[PDB]
Scaffold this active site. Sequence first.
Site, short mmCIF file in Angstrom:
data_model
loop_
_atom_site.label_atom_id
_atom_site.label_comp_id
_atom_site.label_asym_id
_atom_site.label_seq_id
_atom_site.Cartn_x
_atom_site.Cartn_y
_atom_site.Cartn_z
N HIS A 61 28.38 -2.84 13.48
CA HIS A 61 28.82 -1.76 12.50
C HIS A 61 27.62 -1.56 11.50
O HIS A 61 27.29 -0.54 10.99
CB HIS A 61 30.28 -1.70 11.97
CG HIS A 61 31.11 -2.47 12.81
ND1 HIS A 61 30.92 -2.95 13.93
CD2 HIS A 61 32.32 -3.03 12.41
CE1 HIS A 61 31.99 -3.63 14.76
NE2 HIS A 61 32.96 -3.49 13.66
N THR A 195 36.75 0.35 3.86
CA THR A 195 36.45 1.66 4.55
C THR A 195 36.29 1.51 5.97
O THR A 195 36.17 2.32 6.87
CB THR A 195 35.60 2.55 3.83
OG1 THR A 195 34.40 1.97 3.89
CG2 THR A 195 35.93 2.64 2.66
ZN LIG Z 1 31.51 -0.71 2.95
#
Ligand SMILES: [Zn+2]
Length: 257
Positions: A61, A195
């Site tokens: 990611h 997040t």
């Molecule tokens: Zn972050």
Amino acid sequence: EWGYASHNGPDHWHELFPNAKGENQSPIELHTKDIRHDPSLQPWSVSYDGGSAKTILNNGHTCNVVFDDTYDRSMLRGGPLPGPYRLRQFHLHWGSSDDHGSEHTVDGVKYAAELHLVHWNPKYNTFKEALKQRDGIAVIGIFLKIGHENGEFQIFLDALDKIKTKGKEAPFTKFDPSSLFPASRDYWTYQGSFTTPPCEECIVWLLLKEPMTVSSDQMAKLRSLLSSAENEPPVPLVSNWRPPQPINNRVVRASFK
Ligand SMILES: [Zn+2]
């Protein structure tokens, strides 16, 4: 087993991670006219140790720099925090061109990347046990705005060559990420979440009003990283921001008039 695409995007994360859909999610829109000064907000400080750095990974990611937190080493304190907190990691979030890429927004206005410095409270024994407190994590948030090259940031960029691909790890020592900080330490503070999944509602946010400037070509080096291992089919990591979630009734305070 999550993503920023279209069948794994954030839209879906809760299908497997259901914090994802709580009442205290980050990031948020910051509407400066709904935000008030709080004169009881003190300034924050760091003592960091450049020798704490250990590794730099690409977890598929994002790019991570990890630090040693086995004891009280590189420390964040003051502000709204209750206590001193330990540095553990930083990474970033970006999009696919310069007009956007930050997670937080300020009065509509988007930045080209967001840098997150993650800390945790020693009071809670363990990074993993602090994920269950409301104030167990502290994140320093920094915006990236296009401009002139940053040299301390280059240091970091140069190392990306060695983790290009998901999976890859490499050593990374002697870097003090306070070097990245801008001149002001004016701050917005709120309570929210991580997040990325599993989206724990663990976070005291400290967002800095002032953006660290960087170069477009610096930005496109971040945009090169990829999200497929070596033995596997290329694919670029072109965006990794999450879109703003609901404030509900949450109070955002500013350090500053
Ligand atoms: Zn972050």
